[PDB]
Structure formats: C-alpha cells, structure tokens
Amino acid sequence: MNKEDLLKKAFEAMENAYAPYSNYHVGACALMKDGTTFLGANIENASYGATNCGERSAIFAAYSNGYRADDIEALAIVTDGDRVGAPCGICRQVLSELLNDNTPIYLSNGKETLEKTIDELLPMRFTKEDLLGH
Amino acid sequence: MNKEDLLKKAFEAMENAYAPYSNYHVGACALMKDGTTFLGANIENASYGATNCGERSAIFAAYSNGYRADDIEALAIVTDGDRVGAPCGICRQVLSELLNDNTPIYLSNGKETLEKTIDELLPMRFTKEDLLGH
Amino acid sequence: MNKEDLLKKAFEAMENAYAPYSNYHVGACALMKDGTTFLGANIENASYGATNCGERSAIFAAYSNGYRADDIEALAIVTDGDRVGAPCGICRQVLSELLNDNTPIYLSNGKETLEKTIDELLPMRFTKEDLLGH
Amino acid sequence: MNKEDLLKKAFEAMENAYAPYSNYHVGACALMKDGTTFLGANIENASYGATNCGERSAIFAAYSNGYRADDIEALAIVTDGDRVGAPCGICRQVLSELLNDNTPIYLSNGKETLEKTIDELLPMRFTKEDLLGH
Ligand SMILES: [Zn+2]
Ligand SMILES: [Zn+2]
Ligand SMILES: [Zn+2]
Ligand SMILES: [Zn+2]
C-alpha cells in the first residue's frame, strides 16, 4: 500500500470518530508489513480524561492482534485542521515505546502532508530500558 | 457466537498482551451483532499512566471501525487471576458511555465465570447527557 | 473542621477550576487528621485525555506532601450540577487505592448533599493485593 | 528562591512518592512568583493507567489554588536515574498548556542538571488555539 492509499484509510477512519464534546475528528491507520490495516479514531468520554486518541486506537488494535513494532510498516494520522497536526504528547509517549525509529508517521490535514519519525517528535525519551535497567 | 467461544477469543487476546512491567495479562473480545469480533489486550508503557487496558483496546477498535453501542452484542474480559476480576474504574467510565445497559460483560479467570452489565459495576454514573444538558 | 466547612472549602476550590473547553467546574478538598487541607479543581487540556479531575488534584497534592490513607480524615467533592454527582470511574479507581474503605466522601451540588464511601461507589475492586499476589 | 534551593525542594518531594509497583521515585516542585511552592511526587495505582506523574501533581496543585501560567516562576523535576530525565510525553502535553513558553524547567538526577523549556521538549505543539479555532 502506498502513502496516498494509507492516508485514504485514515480519512475513512476519521468519519468513525466519537467526539460529541469537541466535534474534533481524528483518523488514523496503522499499516502492518503483511498488508493488514488497523483503523483508529478518537473516542471521547463525558469524563474528558478517559478520552482516547485515534492513533492510540489504531496502534492498540494492532498490538492486541499480536503485531509488534517490528511488524508495523507505517502509521497515518489525519485531521481537517487549518494546519498539519502531530500526535499529542500522550500519543508520542505511547509511540516512543511501540514504534521503531524508522517507521514513518504520515500526517495530513487534507491540504498538506508531512512525514515524521517518532524520534523527531519526542526528544529525551524515557524508554523501557531506562526503567527496566534502573 | 456463544459465551464459551467468545471467552476463548478473549483468552487468545490475553496472549497478545504487552505487559513488560507488571507481567499481568488481560484479554478481551468485543462481539458485534453482525458477528465481527475485536480483540483487545492490555498495553503498558514505561510511563505507567500511558498504559491502556485490554477491554478499552477492544471497544476502541470496534468504535474506530464504525460500530456503536447499539451494534455491540457482548464483551468478554479475562485474566488468569486467583479470583474473577472486573474492569477497573477507568474502563467502567468508558464502558458506561460506550455500552448500552443490556449488553453482557462476561468475566472469567479460567476457573469461574461471571456475567455483569455496566450499571451493576458503576453506581451514580456521570453521563453524556449530564454534561451536554448542563 | 465540620462537614459544612469542608464543603465550603471545596466550593472555594471549584472557583479555581481550569475548564476552558467544557466550562464544567468541579471543586474538591481533602482534609487531613492534623487539620491540613488540600484544594483540588479540574484542569482541562486541549488534548482531552490529559485532563485531570478535581478530586485527583486534591488527593495527589496530599500524597505529594507525605500524607497517606491513614493520615486523611475526609474528602469533599462539589459541583453546580442539576443533581449530586459522584467521582468518575477514573477517580474511583484512584480513591480505591489512596483512601481507607470508610473515609467519608461528601458530595454536594449546593442544593443537596450526600455522604458516600469508596466501597459504595466501586464494587468488585481491583486492589494492590490482587496485583501483588498474581 | 534560587535554582539549587528549588531542586532541593524537588528532592524533598521525591521522598514522598507513592510508587509501590515500580519503586521509581520522581519529585517536582513548582515555584510561584510570590514565593509559594507546590511539591509533587509520582503516585501509582494498581491499574497502571491511573498513575500520576510528579510534575503533574505539582502543577495541578498550583492551579487548584488559583495560580495560572503567568504566576509560575519555575518548575524543578528530579530523579535518581543514571541519566537526567525529562518529563514524559503526557506531562509535556500538560505543561504545553499550563506553562509559558520560556518558564524554566530544571531537571536533575543528583549528578547532573539541565535546564529546558517546554518548546524545547515538545515540537509541533497542539494548542488551545488549534482546538478553539477548529
Ligand atoms: Zn493523542
Ligand atoms: Zn481498566
Ligand atoms: Zn474523575
Ligand atoms: Zn509524566
């Protein structure tokens, strides 16, 4: 699957968002090396702190089906915002552990597209081995 | 799909848990009325507060693919613990919004099985309409 | 300090809430046996999942200053809602860990007042011992 | 208060951490322009996702007592780790909203000290304006 088709999957996921409170929709799609895709959308809650982000929905779905970082080809995350948005800090913390440093993260607001890797988005990362080796 | 087969799916999901820090594995499976299943497993992070529970993984996956409360037939959540466990308070807050009150939640530790609905697990719920009608 | 004066502290805390997105204000006050009080208010974030609840703000402040469950006398949580609200499921999971079973939790919307304990609000608790004994 | 004395307060807070699961202790101290300090420490939960970080404990306490970003002089965050640690991505998302761009964040492991600002720690921030303008 090419970048444009993966972004199309993420825009399809964006229509599945559950965002009664903000009305702000985020779509994501995690593409596995074997070609399997996992959609993700943001899912809000009346208790706002229980809200989940769309890119977390997608990666948690992939891991729950037995995929691991080494099995993931790419992640796309999209909005219809005025500028291209990046994953929030919570999602960066998750992706810092669950993605390898070469996995592209494609970001698009439907007008422009950017490509990042997780190390660019989160300096001075606190890692699994920082904790396990403590 | 019967209860025993749904529990078997959740036990499968339990083997996909990512829990390097606690070693405690939770599996879940959300069954849609159309027969589709969504696995969920707990996914930990070196920053413990970014951990996601397995039943959240499963329900977020279902919603991210366009299913809503009315489309969900049942949810199973399993462990290998010494007693049958219920969803934690975070997950109860999520399920209080994302499940209807008649949807069975099957709980099993592999030795005993219980059936609950969300209202039993969370008294005095704070709901979408409590917030939107404020 | 009596119940009415503790509720008054929680109403003071409610005026400190940071809720630019929902405009829904929650106040809390944790009272220590030595007479010390800790205010808490809800504090929202543009990434909704990073929002903190007021009763968590209060209890985390108490613990961060060295207090523990046996050092705490009571917790008050208040709103201006149409009915008396209880802590959300996230907060119940926290209070299940950080309060003793019978420590009073006073709830008020300014029109009615209720008294609860954590056991009444959270059946089938997942506890420290369930995890440590696994 | 000077930088060394603020770090000393954060090290005092670190001794108040509640980390029964990881045994990893973090302390923080938020210093207000009026001289008031707020300690924060990490506070774990048997449901790991309900864990709170120390720097969030501190900043939520400040806001719950009425302080806002313009009042915050500095934040210190400390550990005893092998290398100097930065706030995790969750905490960066919170600090992006609750601190001004140039408020100093002092980091120390007791052997080395660094000074950062939130802009250095979190590129491509998703802000209140991005949401409110949507
Ligand atoms: Zn996010
Ligand atoms: Zn849970
Ligand atoms: Zn809450
Ligand atoms: Zn943190």
Author numbering:
A (entry chain B), B (entry chain D), C (entry chain C), D (entry chain A): 1 to 134
Give the original sentences from the paper that presented this experimental model.
CDA_F14 was chosen as the crystallization object because of its wide substrate specificity. Asymmetric unit contained eight CDA_F14 subunits forming tetramers. Each subunit of the CDA_F14 tetramer consisted of a core of five β strands (β1 to β5) sandwiched by five α helices (α1 to α5) and exhibited a fold characteristic of the CDA family. The catalytic zinc ion in CDA_F14 was coordinated by three cysteine residues located in α helices α2 (Cys53) and α3 (Cys91 and Cys88). Three subunits were involved in the formation of the active center. In the crystal structure, the active site was occupied by two molecules of 2-methyl-2,4-pentanediol, which was used as a crystallization agent. N4-benzoyl-2′-deoxycytidine was docked into the determined structure of CDA_F14, and the following interacting residues of amino acids were found: Glu55, Asn42, Glu44, Gly54, Cys88, Tyr24, Ala46(D), and Tyr48(D). The hydrophobic substrate binding pocket area of CDA_F14 (distance to the docked substrate shorter than 3.9 Å) was formed by Val26, Ile77, Thr79, Gly85, Ala86, Pro87, Leu107, Phe126(B), and Leu131(B). The β3α3 loop (amino acids 79 to 88) of CDA_F14, connecting the third β strand to the fourth α helix, was identified as most likely to influence the space for binding of N4-substituted nucleosides. The CDA_F14 had Gly81 and Gly85 at the corresponding positions; consequently, the binding pocket of CDA_F14 was larger than that in CDA_Mmu.
